[model samples]
Target: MKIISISETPNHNTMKITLSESREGMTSDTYTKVDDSQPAFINDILKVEGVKSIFHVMDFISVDKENDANWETVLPKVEAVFELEHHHHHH
Candidate 1:
């Protein structure tokens, strides 16, 4: 499968998702309040339609594009999940 460098976190976004040199793995060094509940966070991303593959590290989630898939439809879903999780603060 051909892997692509998809969207990346903005410099100010405070999330870092890095791809390994071999492209076999990724690392996510998210800011504070981003590491907790990682499993569930990853699961929510995997729930997006057309999300064929994924790998999560700390604050970044690496997603694989499905063959014949369009990002227009998939991106919003992923963004929504990220927003929801990011803003979910419990006092």
Candidate 2:
């Protein structure tokens, strides 16, 4: 699936990302950090600077960042992860 959009939430520290499709084997709850139970994408997400946690349910992915982080600075990095993931999963 591809990333359809990434938008801001009412909470300044969080962002909501919509995917073109939802795949199986994804977490249904928030993952506070990387671990065996989390998806690979979530591990990549958590590796980004300022990222605090990730919530995955259906086709939506919500990210929670550190209080001091700026979306302006962090958004592009987050977007890149999905962008790269899309291509990596394809031929």
Candidate 3:
């Protein structure tokens, strides 16, 4: 999976990312933390520093970051979660 695009909201503390993949059948529309039935992507993203919550709908994923966090540091970490190589098995 890859991020197709990313956009910020009014305060820029929240951002919406569009993914090249979709999870229509796996889980519900939102998740802020790891849950038993939640998708792996949700869990992966929440692991990123400064990420507070997540709203995943279709191929679009919206995330809330801490107001004190810098996007310059957080954005690349968030992007790494969806990169194809992130799921690779390390030997």
Candidate 4:
């Protein structure tokens, strides 16, 4: 899968990243699975409301002819997404 485009609302904590890979035969609310161990790619979106803090690929986005995509470029930015923890009592 490749990252086509990324956008976030002004002052929004979670970003809306559009993946280029088409989800022709996939569920609308897709998510990666794991067993016994942690997920390969799961992030806790900081300062989000409610209890849905888990951040994955925000579903699939359309691939346009003008869009030439690559995750390598966005991977660095993705790596930067992290949750700040407290030493005494981490939240």
Candidate of highest lDDT: 2
> Candidate 1 or 4, higher TM-score?
1
Q: Write candidate 1's Cα lDDT for 1-91 as tens digits.
A: 1122344654322223332234444354331233334556555555656665554564345556466666677656555544453444689
**TM-score against native, each model:** 0.43, 0.72, 0.69, 0.33
Q: What are the clashing pairs of model 3? A: none
Q: Model 3: per-residue lDDT, tens digit, 3-87?
A: 8878556667777777777666424466774763665765766777787777777677777888898878877777766664654
Per-model lDDT:
0.47, 0.75, 0.70, 0.36
TM-score of 2: 0.72
Ranking by lDDT: 2, 3, 1, 4
- Per-residue lDDT of 1-91 in model 2, one digit per residue for the tens? 5579776578888778888776674557787747849656657767878888878787788888999988787777667766663433556
Off by over 4 Å in 1: 1-41, 57-60, 85-91
lDDT of 2: 0.75
| Worst ten in a row by lDDT for model 2 | 81-90
